[PDB]
Design a protein around this nucleic acid. Structure first.
Lengths: 223, 211
RNA sequence: GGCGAUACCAGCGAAACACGCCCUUGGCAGCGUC
């Protein structure tokens, strides 16, 4: 049906430039208004820009006016957001949104995309170091044990941490990343398991950091 | 530009509670106000448009009203699928502006935290840095005090809290103490102290360097 | 009531602007003419 696929996000220095795309499927953008809305990590939605059908008129927020350019290519069924003079303030997930048809939904934004992550910083890409969180309860306690992994000092976001290659999801907790004073991110992933499975069940944390092409699997068993 | 002041910024309510979220415009926006529902890690979804018109596929528990420049979104009774953040947005004039959002969380009985302490990792001490991790598994509410074990440390600890679990409505917390490995081997017993409402007394989990 | 223009705000055309439509209305407008 209707789909919005944003691309072009990444990591850039302050003052750099980026060009985001929004590929539309299931409808033709020449009959609708296309909006861009961004969301900083842990904050609210912020309207960025929009383009109107038939006339191609464009509108911008005060925080991006002069630095951004929204446009469309109806032959490609794709909208674009040119980003220039980027500041750290522009670090956010950038959503693409279709304004619905006036008769059925008014001026509401009835369809959104998954978003693309734009990081504006002078910090260089760095991969994380991974260390285990050894389980506390032993193999024959009769209760529950907590184990995990600590991946530390990485930039930029994001990472993905799985356990047993996605086979273990009950009781897992991958904590949001915190920013250390060194400027690099760090988080922990834990899981509670029955003590009767220690020694017979295999536990591996799979950490994935695509921005740096870093792949690590670290084993977690009773120390 | 038209400012959208939304209130409250967050609430905790139980299933079956009638809630009304208020979004007030700084100037006349007619009725060109919509509401969106955003669940952690997902894309927003349209709920109602034109201040009071329900969008297709959205249950009848959602309603909206206008009183001049005032706009309220009302869920008649909370249900176990409505945990999310809600935003108001005006489309009367450009630039379109969103409200600050309202975080809707689920009220539930008090749950005590299960505490675990993890010593620094033998692979990590090789790197010259130390990191002790205290874990506070599944509790309610988010309010918890973690203090590091013996002068009490200050300024060298960071905390992180998960979102509300969609099943048991609990929270989890981590705390990491750094310093250096040289400092790590000059002290002996390490312990994290946690205070929680579901705890009659502060609970301290510790370990001896040497198993 | 009769005859002809005039599209301000709404509504409508896949349509916030531009383009187009709808003429006492969709608003208990207002200027010409019997």
């Amino acid at each position: 049906e209707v789909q919005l696929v944003e691309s072009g996000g990444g990591l850039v220095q302050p003052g750099g430039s980026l060009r985001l795309s929004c590929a539309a499927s299931g409808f033709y953008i020449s009959y609708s208004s296309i909006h861009w809305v961004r969301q900083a990590p842990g904050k609210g939605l912020e309207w960025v820009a929009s383009i109107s059908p038939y006339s191609g008129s464009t509108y911008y927020a005060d925080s991006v006016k002069g630095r951004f350019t929204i446009s469309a290519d109806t032959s490609k069924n794709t909208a674009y957001l040119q980003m220039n003079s980027l500041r750290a303030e522009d670090t956010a997930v950038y959503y693409c949104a279709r304004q619905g048809y006036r008769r059925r939904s008014g001026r509401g934004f009835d369809y959104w995309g998954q978003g693309t992550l734009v990081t504006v910083s002078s910090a260089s890409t760095k991969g994380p170091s991974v260390f285990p969180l050894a389980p506390s309860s032993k193999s024959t306690s009769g209760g529950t044990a907590a184990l995990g992994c600590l991946v530390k000092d990485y930039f930029p976001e994001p990472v993905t941490v799985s356990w047993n290659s996605g086979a273990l999801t009950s009781g897992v907790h991958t904590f949001p990343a915190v920013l250390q004073s060194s400027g690099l991110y760090s988080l922990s992933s834990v899981v509670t398991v029955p003590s009767s499975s220690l020694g017979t069940q295999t536990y591996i944390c799979n950490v994935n950091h695509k921005p740096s092409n870093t792949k690590v699997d670290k084993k977690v068993e009773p120390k | 530009d038209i400012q959208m002041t939304q209130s409250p910024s967050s609430l905790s309510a139980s299933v079956g509670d009638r809630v009304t979220i208020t979004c007030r415009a700084s100037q006349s926006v007619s009725s060109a106000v919509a509401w969106y529902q955003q669940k952690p890690g997902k894309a927003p979804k349209l709920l109602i448009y034109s201040a009071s018109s329900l969008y297709s596929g959205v249950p009848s528990r959602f309603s909206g009203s206008r009183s001049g420049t005032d706009f309220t979104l009302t869920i008649s009774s909370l249900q176990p699928e409505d945990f999310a953040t809600y935003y108001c947005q005006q489309s009367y004039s450009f630039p379109n502006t969103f409200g600050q959002g309202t975080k809707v969380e689920i009220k539930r009985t008090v749950a005590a935290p299960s505490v675990f302490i993890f010593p620094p990792s033998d692979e990590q001490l090789k790197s010259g840095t130390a990191s002790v991790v205290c874990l506070l598994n599944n509790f309610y509410p988010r309010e918890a005090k973690v203090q590091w074990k013996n002068a009490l440390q200050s300024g060298n600890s960071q905390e992180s809290v998960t979102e509300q679990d969609s099943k048991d409505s609990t929270y989890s917390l981590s705390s990491t103490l750094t310093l250096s490995k040289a400092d790590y081997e000059k002290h002996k017993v390490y312990a994290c102290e946690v205070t929680h409402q579901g705890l009659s007394s502060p609970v301290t989990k510790s370990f001896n360097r040497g198993e």
